[PDB]
Amino acid sequence: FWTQLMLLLWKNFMYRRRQPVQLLVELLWPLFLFFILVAVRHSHPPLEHHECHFPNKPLPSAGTVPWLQGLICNVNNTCFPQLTPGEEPGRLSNFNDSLVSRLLADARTVLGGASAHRAEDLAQELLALRSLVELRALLQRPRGTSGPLELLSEALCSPACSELIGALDSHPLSRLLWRRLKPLILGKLLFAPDTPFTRKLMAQVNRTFEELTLLRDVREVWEMLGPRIFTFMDAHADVGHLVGTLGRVTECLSLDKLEAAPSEAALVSRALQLLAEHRFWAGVVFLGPEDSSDPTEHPTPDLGPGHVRIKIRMDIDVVTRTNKIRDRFWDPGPAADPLTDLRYVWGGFVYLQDLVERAAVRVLSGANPRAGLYLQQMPYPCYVDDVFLRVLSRSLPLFLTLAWIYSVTLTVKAVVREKETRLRDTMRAMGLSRAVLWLGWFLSCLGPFLLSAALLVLVLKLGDILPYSHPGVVFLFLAAFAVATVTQSFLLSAFFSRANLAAACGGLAYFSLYLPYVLCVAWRDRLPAGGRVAASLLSPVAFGFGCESLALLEEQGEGAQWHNVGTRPTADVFSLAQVSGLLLLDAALYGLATWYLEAVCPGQYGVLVEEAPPGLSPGVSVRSLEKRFPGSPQPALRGLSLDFYQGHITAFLGHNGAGKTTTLSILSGLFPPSGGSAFILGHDVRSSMAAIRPHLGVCPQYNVLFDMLTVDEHVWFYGRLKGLSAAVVGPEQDRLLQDVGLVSKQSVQTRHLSGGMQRKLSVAIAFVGGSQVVILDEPTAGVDPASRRGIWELLLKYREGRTLILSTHHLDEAELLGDRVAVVAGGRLCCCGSPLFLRRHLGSGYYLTLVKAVGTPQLLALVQHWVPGARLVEELPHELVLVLPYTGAHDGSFATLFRELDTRLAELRLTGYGISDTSLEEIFLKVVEECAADTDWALTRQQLQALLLKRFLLARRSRRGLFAQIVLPALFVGLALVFSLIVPPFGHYPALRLSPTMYGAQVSFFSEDAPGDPGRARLLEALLQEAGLEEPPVQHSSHRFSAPEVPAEVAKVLASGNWTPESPSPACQCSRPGARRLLPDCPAAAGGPPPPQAVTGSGEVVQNLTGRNLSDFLVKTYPRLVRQGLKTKKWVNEVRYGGFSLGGRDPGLPSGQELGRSVEELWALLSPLPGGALDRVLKNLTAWAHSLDAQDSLKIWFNNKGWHSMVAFVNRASNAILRAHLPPGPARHAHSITTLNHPLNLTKEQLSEGALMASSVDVLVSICVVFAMSFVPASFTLVLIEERVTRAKHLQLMGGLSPTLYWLGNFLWDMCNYLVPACIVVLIFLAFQQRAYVAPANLPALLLLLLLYGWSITPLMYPASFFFSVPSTAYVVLTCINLFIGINGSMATFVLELFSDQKLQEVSRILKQVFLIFPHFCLGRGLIDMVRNQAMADAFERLQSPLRWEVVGKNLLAMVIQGPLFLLFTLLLQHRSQEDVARERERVVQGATQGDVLVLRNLTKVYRGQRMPAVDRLCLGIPPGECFGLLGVNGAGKTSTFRMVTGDTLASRGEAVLAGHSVAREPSAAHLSMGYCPQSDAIFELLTGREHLELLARLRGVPEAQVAQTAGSGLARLGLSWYADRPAGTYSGGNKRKLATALALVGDPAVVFLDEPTTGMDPSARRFLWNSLLAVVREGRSVMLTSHSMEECEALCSRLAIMVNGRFRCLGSPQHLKGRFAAGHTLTLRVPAARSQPAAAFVAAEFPGAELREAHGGRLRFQLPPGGRCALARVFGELAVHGAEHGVEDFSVSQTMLEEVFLYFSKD
Ligand SMILES: Nc1ncnc2c1ncn2[C@@H]1O[C@H](COP(=O)(O)OP(=O)(O)OP(O)(O)=S)[C@@H](O)[C@H]1O
Ligand SMILES: Nc1ncnc2c1ncn2[C@@H]1O[C@H](COP(=O)(O)OP(=O)(O)OP(O)(O)=S)[C@@H](O)[C@H]1O
Ligand SMILES: *[C@@H]1O[C@H](CO)[C@@H](O[C@@H]2O[C@H](CO)[C@@H](O)[C@H](O)[C@H]2NC(C)=O)[C@H](O)[C@H]1NC(C)=O
Ligand SMILES: *[C@@H]1O[C@H](CO)[C@@H](O[C@@H]2O[C@H](CO)[C@@H](O)[C@H](O)[C@H]2NC(C)=O)[C@H](O)[C@H]1NC(C)=O
Ligand SMILES: *[C@@H]1O[C@H](CO)[C@@H](O)[C@H](O)[C@H]1NC(C)=O
Ligand SMILES: *[C@@H]1O[C@H](CO)[C@@H](O)[C@H](O)[C@H]1NC(C)=O
Ligand SMILES: *[C@@H]1O[C@H](CO)[C@@H](O)[C@H](O)[C@H]1NC(C)=O
Ligand SMILES: *[C@@H]1O[C@H](CO)[C@@H](O)[C@H](O)[C@H]1NC(C)=O
């Protein structure tokens, strides 16, 4: 059991070692992919980012100075690691060291002090002020700045406008700020409705800009107070310079920047016009509830007024996209980038929403609410950003499968190859169980897999791809994967019966099972938990599911290790060990599947007796052996009771189908006997089992050798397997090697270098165990007769002792070697015995014939006198045949009769006698039928016409296939167009209702500071009851404690620490220690320790958090909220989006009443102006001082990952304020405000880019058209490939056909066939009303493009007919290649077009400039280009043409240029090719006979590497009036000479001339008069035979009116009347041969060539061929016939030439040969002594001529000079003594037998 496994493993290792280039490629292919992966890793290392905090943004409602301060200082949005002062519940401002704030505080305190006082005291107070000094220093600055923006930033933290432009264009930061401010400074507010209510709303919009325009009055009062004081009496210059600077800034002010529009269409037109001038900024639409014109939204929520809907339309390049709520790829980032994401800050959307909402509340409420709104960004933890790990999670299975596709292909190829040559059956014959075979396969294939896995593990660990992990677990994963994939490859090898088919399908079967993993990862959340395990039954799917868990565990900073093998890293991911368990279960299931499937198709591979020897020792005793198959009710083998005997070489006789090899397999260990017994050596076959193998040898009818192992390893392997010991193999090896004469070959150790002799070696293998019984099976099945002598010598060498049982098809072989013969025919035995006994039992006797150049009764009386027995069988004139009695036949009587007849020859006028001994052939036949009975220019026009007709009939023969290949794609396209009538989603921007409720269930805040006020209490009530909470606040007091219970294990930790809310209460948080990377921060159990009070309303949770830290709580709690949905990381639903803090502390000085009183007192005094301008200024100042209190504020925290959170929460705040200031009652339900977002249409320049991303249905239609359009050329080319496989094409070429004209005819017919599908597609497009195609300016372009693409595509794959030789696979491969090329081109172009965000891809347009050289992509590009150009034209002017040579003209021109070059290439590819014997050779050399039709001279062929000429130095001459014949054994070179003379092949040396026209010098006239007939059937099965006949008739040039009549003649000479109507496909075996003969004969060629015209068909067919050839030979025409059957050559031909080894031998007429050497007699002696000298000596002494023939041990034949003067009897009497003189049992004489010419044919 172990020795067989060792031998199998050694053999497999030897196969692998003898291929020293496949191992290297298998090792170095998977390393390339992983080196690419390592390079990719080196390209993108992970990025690290620490914690950072964000400042606050003040809305204009809070103030104007802080507003500009924010717009000028917080533009960069830089992170700050330290906590910002704004976040703390106390402060509400960030800038405390700013000059503006200090100046305002100093002014306030000085004014308060002055008011309290009411000069020296005031001067002293103002002297100690650094802010005034800083302001004076800033005023006294000699430029030093790029522009006023820099000075404004330093202070805070028209031709004049042209000068400002010139100054500000220099500084890049000033450029950025100026770009941000340009839309808004020069803005043009527009509104559609002009009703008075809207007028009041825009009056509320006015009042802000009116407050803005107040510096003019203060300025003018300054210059009207200036000169007065100056006349009454550095500071004066500084104020004037400052005032003039202020005036210059206000010079480039829009002032009246508000405008109006009459209607929505006019609104859009005016907006686009202003965009053309770069002046448009925003537009507002006050849609009314009663209008009911709501696109994709409800008309009105409640009847009547009270609800205001407001739409803001701005430029798309400014307002963010408004289609999807969230990003599709979650990123570990704060999502705070001013340039890209923070668009609402420099876009002004929030500003205008605030302004409009405040106007609406001030109008509807009827009060003047004051509440400053601020915006804050929640802070974000420290993080590591690394996209690569998700890429591994999604990519690693792909690279692993691509690395292991190669070894799987090799494994399946090897398994199928070894199971193809039936070697497995031979191994099972010797006794090896299938289990050992499969175990050898397992352990031999599984080595390289694990070596590759180990190398991959080392690469992964060392290459930093999977660090922080222990390689042991990774290896235990890859090993399970390798086991599963090897088992599944063995399963894949169990469905195929061909080598290359299995090799090319196994890789595809392995790769096609990785797609479901992608399908599952796309809809990751869709699939439940139940279907996960069911889908993970595939091996690659399970590997992917395990790889995702491995990557997920890698993200958490601790890789795969022994600690966490059985731990699930997330609630819905497999543990790493469970995946391996499933992998092993899958491998076991695949193994069981292979085991069961191997048994699905079992079995099928895909009374005369002479028993009396001197020693009766029945070594093999088979009795009544029977077997039956279910294929036929009659048994495969019937009763066979024959008994064999040791020492005799029994043999089997029968024609193929006699069930001999079946029985020989029964006796071996391959098949089971159904009945009877098969006792070998005494013990039954099954009982012996393994007790019989050393004493039983088998050799099968197929050669059994390994193409890589040498001879010595071969004998070693086949000896050690039988039971031989390793010590005694040397002598046995040497014995067999010396016996077979391979002692030289074992020196070079080759197996595939030597051929033909290999069968000999196989025979020797049957004699390696010295087994007593040996069963051979046709040891000379196919070996050349020239080498059967060695096999005969070896088999006779081992003829003693061993029982040998063989079987041969022949009849001569069964008597040379065999000591006995039994005849089996029709699966049954008929007779048995020995050749002597078989020849001694006949109805007839021993024949004697006499010819005439006297009297029958006289000769009969003479014969009866000389011998009593005599039978008269034949009595016709000119030959008298009598039967001499075999019963009691004696030599003396025959000798006396012959001696008497010798003298009386002249008188009797006989002049010749012929004796005859019955032979084995006729007795074999007679017993076979006895057993059978007992069982029961105009010519070119006609040529093209005929070719087109034959193509049309060829198409009409196969109509269903062409119909399904042509019409079906059109119906497919039509159905695709029908089903594509749904609304196309392309990315339009609908109307979106911007409210917080769109996000869904969430958690929100209501933090409050300084709650000591009733108005703030009302505002808080509005905020809470706005979200759906219960109306009475006291109910919350009824709920009392509404918080989750604190964790018990955390209470002790809290008691350990201070736990004050102001101090950091939570414990610290883990982060990146440098040696380890964590994606989130791992949260402890104490983050924001006390669970804050939460109340749930209607799908929403509100939390208190009053008085806590807030920032710390959010930073600590965020990852806990996120992690619930990081398993898939596709659409992450953050739960906390925003919240409110009711801050109340006033950063400014609240004491503004005193300042107002002081201003009023100053207004009363100082001579107020009668006009009141100063009075109005002072009133405005008093109002500003009164409003300076800022009684209540509000801050909104928002999360930026939700795109539309800022606007939703600002809307909520405004609505809450409105509901707060409205008096209580049911009227609260009547009032509401709504805000929408709707970007405007694209401008023309914007359209020129935006039209690109509106093509999905177009892409689908183009893909469908390309897929359905690339089928026809393959259908065209399959027919040509099929006609190339058969040599019928060349048969056409000997007609009038030329290859160029054949190509032209095929091209024209395929054009005519192709013109229909294009018309069908065109009519489908026209009938289905596609505006994209039914336009009159688009139809001609589409038609021309389709027709010219079909023009160009066809000659692409015509040159491919030479490469392939089978129709179906050629069609499949060509279709797949074309579809792959088209789809890849289209996808690459569309991907580069959509993803062309960066500029270095637009130059990739040159790539398409190359694709015009590819003809398949021209149509796909042209359709898309035409569609986009025409759609742009439709959308351009309504709200240049396809025929122009700018969109499709260039592509069409390039493709029509490409058209003819492929036809030229295939036309050039077609024409790529550019003693009697001595006396007749001498007469040919000296001169040429003019009458001879064919003349040859030194005809020679030298193949490549054969080292010997197949046909060498061949000469001949054929007179026209005689039929020729060529003879030779297989391998002589007759077919090579036939091909060379016909012209299908070239000649290495020498040329043959036919009727004075050499083949090379001008082939056309040569082929005009040659009738080609090969052994193969060169016909088209689709057509009919008669149709072939008229096709050849029309090609030749027969007039049409007689062509049909010719058909009758074309059958009248060869019958064919019953088979005329039937198609050529459904005929008989000989019908094809006779049809080929008729096609050769039709047309009346001068000479007719036939290669093996008849090979064992019905006698009627050969009689008809005989008649046809006789006709053509006595009508004065010549035939060159090649055959084997000698009687046909005798009957038909008049000259015979015999050739062996490529050279003539006799070259004479049949009668000349018969008289030259086939006369006399030959003697055969049966000597058992096997001694040459005793038999040779006396024969040479008495007879001068004793030439040897087949000198073997059993028999020897004698050649002697003919024409003995004495009688023939002169030998017989001598033999009558010679039996005593020398050992001779019996004898035979062949004296002018019917087999003399046969004997010479077999002689040489
Ligand atoms: N797959 C099969 N293989 C062999 N024999 C079959 C098969 N199917 C049916 N038979 C039976 O085989 C008989 C016909 O002779 P075969 O057994 O095929 O001859 P054979 O053994 O191939 O002949 P030789 O002369 O020994 S090569 C009929 O009884 C068939 O029904
Ligand atoms: N691929 C090949 N095709 C044809 N002949 C070949 C090929 N390879 C070698 N030969 C030579 O063909 C010769 C043996 O076949 P031939 O005598 O030419 O014809 P044939 O086998 O008698 O023809 P049939 O009767 O039509 S199968 C030897 O010279 C071979 O070396
Ligand atoms: C949020 O927390 C505060 C505590 O700061 C709760 O205020 C209490 O409310 C009840 C009911 O109105 C009063 O009787 C208590 O006197 C309040 N306590 C203090 C110390 O303020 C408040 O109820 C909680 N939620 C709400 C409804 O705002
Ligand atoms: C701006 O876009 C709107 C669509 O949002 C266009 O209005 C539609 O125009 C089509 C004609 O092309 C009509 O069939 C629709 O009924 C219109 N819908 C609406 C809502 O009116 C509008 O024509 C575009 N204007 C410009 C100048 O591009
Ligand atoms: C923002 O800060 C970065 C810090 O490097 C600086 O390089 C950049 O110029 C700043 N940009 C603006 C707009 O201030
Ligand atoms: C602002 O600065 C002043 C003067 O240094 C200081 O008294 C005051 O406490 C500061 N206030 C804040 C908000 O830090
Ligand atoms: C105020 O807005 C109104 C629209 O109601 C507009 O007519 C007017 O010009 C604006 N005021 C000024 C002077 O800009
Ligand atoms: C909040 O927590 C932070 C954590 O650094 C701490 O520095 C800060 O003092 C705390 N502030 C309050 C008022 O809770």
Side-chain angles (χ1 to χ4, degrees), residues 1610-1640:
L1611 58 91
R1613 306 211 308 199
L1614 279 82
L1616 283 157
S1617 59
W1618 191 57
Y1619 284 105
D1621 292 28
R1622 309 273 280 100
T1626 56
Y1627 277 167
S1628 88
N1631 286 5
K1632 273 80 173 179
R1633 279 87 150 163
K1634 69 170 176 152
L1635 202 61
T1637 315
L1639 291 201

Side-chain angles (χ1 to χ4, degrees), residues 1165-1199:
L1165 307 174
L1166 283 190
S1167 74
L1169 303 180
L1174 185 74
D1175 305 352
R1176 297 276 266 184
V1177 164
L1178 294 155
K1179 181 170 52 178
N1180 277 294
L1181 275 183
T1182 52
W1184 177 80
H1186 289 328
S1187 84
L1188 197 82
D1189 200 16
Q1191 290 90 16
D1192 48 353
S1193 168
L1194 191 151
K1195 203 181 282 195
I1196 290 156
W1197 307 77
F1198 72 95
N1199 195 21

Side-chain angles (χ1 to χ4, degrees), residues 191 198-200 202-203 206 210 255-259:
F191 55 87
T198 70
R199 305 221 163 280
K200 304 145 57 179
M202 282 74 75
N206 295 114
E210 290 155 22
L255 194 54
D256 178 43
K257 67 182 291 294
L258 196 148
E259 273 157 2

Side-chain angles (χ1 to χ4, degrees), residues 83 88-89 1061-1064 1108-1109 1111-1112:
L83 193 142
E88 306 179 11
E1062 192 273 330
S1063 190
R1108 221 180 279 192
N1109 192 315
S1111 57
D1112 186 74

Side-chain angles (χ1 to χ4, degrees), residues 891-904:
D891 307 333
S893 300
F894 296 174
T896 51
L897 176 68
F898 283 20
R899 282 185 289 263
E900 200 275 340
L901 265 293
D902 191 10
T903 60
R904 297 208 320 117

Side-chain angles (χ1 to χ4, degrees), residues 1348-1634:
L1348 277 296
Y1349 164 73
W1351 200 104
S1352 172
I1353 185 55
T1354 303
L1356 274 295
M1357 57 185 70
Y1358 278 175
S1361 84
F1362 301 153
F1363 287 6
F1364 292 165
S1365 300
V1366 294
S1368 60
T1369 80
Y1371 159 81
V1372 171
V1373 175
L1374 284 173
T1375 292
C1376 280
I1377 293 171
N1378 276 351
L1379 188 152
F1380 156 80
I1381 283 185
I1383 290 297
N1384 263 32
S1386 304
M1387 295 298 102
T1389 302
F1390 204 52
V1391 159
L1392 294 175
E1393 216 165 10
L1394 275 175
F1395 187 73
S1396 285
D1397 289 335
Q1398 66 90 29
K1399 287 317 166 184
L1400 292 168
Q1401 279 149 343
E1402 73 91 22
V1403 75
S1404 190
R1405 175 258 310 149
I1406 194 179
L1407 179 67
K1408 277 74 69 177
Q1409 279 165 195
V1410 176
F1411 278 174
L1412 55 87
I1413 298 169
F1414 294 11
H1416 198 54
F1417 198 50
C1418 288
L1419 185 84
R1421 192 161 62 87
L1423 268 69
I1424 297 170
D1425 264 344
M1426 192 205 48
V1427 164
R1428 61 94 172 171
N1429 194 24
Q1430 82 194 5
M1432 170 217 88
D1434 183 84
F1436 192 91
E1437 201 201 304
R1438 267 289 186 177
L1439 301 176
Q1440 307 169 4
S1441 292
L1443 61 83
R1444 287 293 310 145
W1445 65 295
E1446 277 77 18
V1447 167
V1448 305
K1450 302 180 171 61
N1451 311 335
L1452 189 141
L1453 183 55
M1455 161 275 268
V1456 72
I1457 284 171
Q1458 288 205 283
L1461 63 85
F1462 303 109
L1463 191 68
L1464 177 56
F1465 186 60
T1466 188
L1467 278 154
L1468 286 175
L1469 196 57
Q1470 180 275 335
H1471 201 193
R1472 49 161 176 216
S1473 183
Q1474 280 157 357
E1475 176 56 35
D1476 305 342
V1477 190
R1479 75 157 171 78
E1480 184 176 0
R1481 201 155 302 185
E1482 293 310 310
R1483 66 180 290 275
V1484 163
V1485 164
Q1486 69 194 87
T1489 302
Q1490 324 302 315
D1492 277 12
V1493 178
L1494 282 72
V1495 178
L1496 298 99
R1497 200 191 201 103
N1498 199 23
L1499 201 68
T1500 312
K1501 190 71 168 71
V1502 180
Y1503 291 166
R1504 294 279 159 150
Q1506 277 309 310
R1507 308 158 187 176
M1508 65 158 309
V1511 175
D1512 200 356
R1513 293 187 205 80
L1514 207 64
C1515 83
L1516 199 78
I1518 293 189
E1522 58 87 19
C1523 179
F1524 200 77
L1526 207 63
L1527 293 162
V1529 65
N1530 287 9
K1534 59 187 186 296
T1535 310
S1536 287
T1537 292
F1538 161 83
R1539 264 197 195 132
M1540 185 180 288
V1541 177
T1542 289
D1544 187 75
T1545 43
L1546 277 182
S1548 306
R1549 172 61 177 94
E1551 62 183 1
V1553 60
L1554 188 151
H1557 296 162
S1558 186
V1559 163
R1561 178 208 65 96
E1562 61 86 19
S1564 66
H1567 320 307
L1568 294 175
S1569 70
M1570 308 211 287
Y1572 174 21
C1573 182
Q1575 181 176 340
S1576 174
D1577 308 328
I1579 61 174
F1580 322 114
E1581 301 299 19
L1582 299 177
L1583 276 72
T1584 77
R1586 68 204 183 270
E1587 192 35 69
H1588 301 105
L1589 197 150
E1590 292 91 7
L1591 163 63
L1592 272 297
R1594 295 209 159 97
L1595 287 166
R1596 179 68 67 191
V1598 167
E1600 293 80 11
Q1602 269 288 314
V1603 160
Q1605 308 288 334
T1606 291
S1609 71
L1611 58 91
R1613 306 211 308 199
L1614 279 82
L1616 283 157
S1617 59
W1618 191 57
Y1619 284 105
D1621 292 28
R1622 309 273 280 100
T1626 56
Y1627 277 167
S1628 88
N1631 286 5
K1632 273 80 173 179
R1633 279 87 150 163
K1634 69 170 176 152

